[PDB]
Design a protein around this nucleic acid. Structure first.
Ligand SMILES: [Mg+2]
Ligand SMILES: [Mg+2]
Ligand SMILES: [Mg+2]
Ligand SMILES: [Mg+2]
Ligand SMILES: [Mg+2]
Ligand SMILES: [Mg+2]
Ligand SMILES: [Mg+2]
Ligand SMILES: [Mg+2]
Ligand SMILES: [Mg+2]
Ligand SMILES: [Mg+2]
Ligand SMILES: [Mg+2]
Ligand SMILES: [Mg+2]
Ligand SMILES: [Mg+2]
Ligand SMILES: [Mg+2]
Ligand SMILES: [Mg+2]
Ligand SMILES: [Mg+2]
Ligand SMILES: [Mg+2]
Lengths: 179, 24, 71, 69, 118, 87
RNA sequence: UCGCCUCCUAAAAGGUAACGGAGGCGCCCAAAGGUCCCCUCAGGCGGGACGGAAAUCCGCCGGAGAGCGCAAGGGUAGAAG
RNA sequence: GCCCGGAUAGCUCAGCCGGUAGAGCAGGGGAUUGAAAAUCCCCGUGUCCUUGGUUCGAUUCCGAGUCCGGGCACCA
RNA sequence: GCAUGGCCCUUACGGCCUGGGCGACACACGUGCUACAAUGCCCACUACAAAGCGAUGCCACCCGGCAACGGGGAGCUAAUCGCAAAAAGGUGGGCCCAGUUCGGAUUGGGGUCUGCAACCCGACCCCAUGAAGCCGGAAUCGCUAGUAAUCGCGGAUCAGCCAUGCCGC
């Protein structure tokens, strides 16, 4: 039992094969990774860490994130050779669907706002990369544990190539778009 | 409370009536 | 895998003020919900929360359209 | 003598340490005219920021001190 | 007695306690109590599981309280900053919006004791 | 906040509506900064008088329960400068 | 100015002077040491919530221009990082 | 090396036998005067030298360390 | 305000209109209002004034609405009708010393009413917010009796109202 799962195997999968498709059961556009970096709102860590973004955001996607740390010298940013300033989380397979699907069509919404996802945003290999104004506002809220408006930036790497093959995969999977 | 609209005094003062100072 | 730390992983309920939705699989039971109440894809959405209360009914298509301005 | 490029300047004269009297600071625009034009006084006074009385006084100082270049 | 959020009055009358919620004034508060058969004058330190949830149900379902509401305002506020809304440029500048006077006063929306005498 | 009426100048309204018959140029300046932002008119470019000049307002549509004046600040101000007392 | 280190002058071994040219040292590290196991950079171009023109991300392209406590040189990712 | 003392706002200095950091200069507001000086009031400015300790709590107490100052040692 | 000698402008320094402005805001000061609370506050009930004002005006009494108001609608040319009811007081209950059931600023939202029209810029009502203030430095003001202090009521202006002002009771 999985939610979207079917949506891709049952739907999208075929509409593509013949709209494109042909021959191999592999050269078909499909996702493989879903990473997401926070960065730490409009003010980074500080010796007194934050890690709430960790513990909280961790389970807003189901599974703790890692901790990245800067590099090189900063000067006018306040940082140094780094440590920390990161805290991101990748993850594929199951959790990839569950996180974006059980949140794609039910979560993303609610946040008081406009049209669809920024069109011209893909590149090659079709990966896109949106990036809400962070705003940790919904889904999985269960208030309290409210210190900063930290949210994130989502990265979605798919197989495919060009933008159509990629876009077709998302567009026909449940990704409202263009303004 | 003379400046508190939501009260007896508040209303009397302002010279008005309402949910908090009914016209008898 | 990774023992410890990881959440709990358990199904619950995705309520919904407009019919059921996604099948439990996260870590939250209750929630405002609202899948979309109007999708949004292209149309079927843009419910533009501007509806001037009781539009029409007054000031409508009258006053005398263009008229015989042609003369 | 005459100037070549039009200039804009301010004339100051603040007298108030002991407080006997006061002062009368002012600003003006000075630019060159075709040869043979002579002198001219532009009376560009707005809402009366200056008394219609001290004007000729501020002119009898320009014109006057205009003797020696 | 965690109600709308994490605000558990107690030691204080239920009618006065509720107030401590961000959406519950003596008004609404006093209503919910008579729409749940709860005796107002009863301290929270006596509320029964029954009444507690029996009440928690109403309050927490009807209107949108603490946090939930909070966000609303913020939204409405920013929406006034669109194409050039005056009541909006008012929030931006950080001055009164309800037509008040600024030559003097207006301190509630300004910094107490600014000075700056040339 | 008026009553059961909704207000709009009859002639600021016309120029608009008869224009919706065909649709075109946004060259539509009105001094009626007093009229309610034309709901049944979300998209033209209205030139609301500023008391000094006509400030074009794109008038999107998220702004319909307002007035054409709310989008034409009438006063000009950009911080103060120096004080001076002793008088 | 006076001892020590790097480069040049030094004429393709080594060495080589002048009050010749140009910079450093008088420390430091218990992890910046030993070993075992993993990992690979800088930038360029995309796409990116706050994001400078380098915070951290994602995708290609990139044999080393990054890194190696501090001068300079030599060395170095088939690692010394 | 030994004893003794000192380091507190940009400068000049109080800090009382533990809790809080202050006068002064300068400047900015006020107040007083019919007015201008003079005078009064109110502001903003601290790693309290650094380290470890003691205490619920340290600028204060204790131990060391650096840099000043005073006296006496002495320096392969 | 008006009047008035002289000076000055007369396709404008006169006149009309729409819109703005006199309501601006880093700041300073004057007069005030509301307070910081228990000799207080809140709610229900129950008393005792004076001086004034009212016909395209004051508007009883009903009814819808929680309200503001809205429909209906009597009387009243008003010592004959009503704007009223005065408030502080009194009685019963509630609060229990906390930035509070003190205080109400500010802000969001939903409405009402006047007027062609309430963006700048009205007044009310209702829900939700609920700020500074728990007594005030140098200084400084008022009052010698039904005065001060405190409580409310009326009127002129006025469609409405920014009146916390003013003249009065
Ligand atoms: Mg109150
Ligand atoms: Mg050689
Ligand atoms: Mg040789
Ligand atoms: Mg090791
Ligand atoms: Mg005006
Ligand atoms: Mg005025
Ligand atoms: Mg104003
Ligand atoms: Mg008073
Ligand atoms: Mg009723
Ligand atoms: Mg009692
Ligand atoms: Mg207005
Ligand atoms: Mg409050
Ligand atoms: Mg306070
Ligand atoms: Mg107190
Ligand atoms: Mg006397
Ligand atoms: Mg009136
Ligand atoms: Mg006002």
């Amino acid at each position: 039992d999985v939610a979207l799962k079917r949506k891709y195997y049952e739907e999208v999968r075929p509409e593509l094969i013949r709209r494109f498709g042909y021959q191999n059961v592999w050269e078909v556009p499909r996702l493989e990774k879903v990473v997401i970096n926070q960065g730490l709102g409009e003010a980074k860590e500080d010796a007194r860490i934050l890690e709430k973004a960790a513990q909280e955001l961790a389970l807003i996607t189901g599974q703790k994130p890692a901790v990245t740390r800067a590099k090189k010298s900063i000067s006018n940013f306040k940082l140094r050779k780094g440590m920390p300033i990161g805290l991101r989380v990748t993850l594929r397979r199951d959790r990839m669907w569950i996180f974006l699907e059980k949140l794609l069509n039910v979560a993303l919404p609610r946040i008081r706002d406009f049209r669809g996802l920024n069109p011209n945003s893909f590149d090659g290999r079709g990966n896109y990369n949106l990036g809400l104004r962070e705003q940790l506002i919904f889904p999985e809220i269960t208030y309290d544990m409210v210190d900063a408006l930290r949210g994130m930036d989502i990265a979605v790497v798919t197989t495919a190539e060009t933008d159509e093959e990629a876009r077709a995969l998302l567009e026909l999977l449940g990704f409202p778009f263009r303004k | 409370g003379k400046g508190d609209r939501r009260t007896r005094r508040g209303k009397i003062w302002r010279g008005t009536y309402g949910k908090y100072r009914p016209r008898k | 895998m990774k023992e410890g730390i990881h959440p709990k992983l358990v199904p619950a309920r995705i309520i919904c003020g407009c019919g059921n939705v996604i099948e439990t699989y996260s870590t939250k039971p209750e929630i405002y919900v609202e899948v979309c109440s109007k999708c949004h894809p292209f149309y079927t959405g843009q419910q533009r929360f501007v509806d001037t209360e009781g539009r029409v009914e007054r000031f409508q298509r009258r006053y005398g359209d263009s008229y015989r301005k042609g003369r | 003598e005459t100037i070549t490029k039009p200039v804009d300047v301010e004339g100051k004269f603040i007298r108030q340490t002991g407080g006997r009297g006061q002062y009368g600071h002012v600003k003006i625009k000075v630019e060159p005219l075709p040869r043979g034009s002579g002198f001219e006084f532009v009376n560009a006074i707005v809402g009366g920021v200056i008394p219609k009385e001290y004007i000729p006084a501020v002119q009898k100082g320009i014109e006057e001190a205009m003797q020696s270049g | 007695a965690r109600i709308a959020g994490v605000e558990i009055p107690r030691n204080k009358r239920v009618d006065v306690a509720l107030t401590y919620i961000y959406g519950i004034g003596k008004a609404r508060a006093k209503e919910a109590l008579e729409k749940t058969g709860i005796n107002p004058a009863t301290r929270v330190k006596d509320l029964t599981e029954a009444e507690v949830v029996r009440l928690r149900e109403y309050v927490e379902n009807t209107w949108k309280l603490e946090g939930e509401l909070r966000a609303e305002v913020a939204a409405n506020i920013k929406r006034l900053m669109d194409i050039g809304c005056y009541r909006g440029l008012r929030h931006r500048r950080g001055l009164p919006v309800r037509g008040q006077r600024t030559r003097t006063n207006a301190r509630t929306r300004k910094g107490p004791r600014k000075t700056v005498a040339g | 906040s008026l009553k059961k009426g909704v207000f709009v100048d009859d002639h600021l309204l016309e120029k608009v509506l008869e224009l919706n018959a065909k649709g075109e140029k946004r060259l539509i300046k009105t001094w009626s900064r007093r009229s309610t932002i034309v709901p049944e008119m979300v998209g033209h470019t209205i030139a609301v008088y500023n008391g000094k000049q006509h400030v074009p307002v794109y008038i999107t549509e998220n702004m319909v329960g307002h007035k054409l004046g709310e989008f034409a600040p009438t006063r000009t101000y950009r911080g103060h400068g120096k004080e001076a007392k002793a008088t």
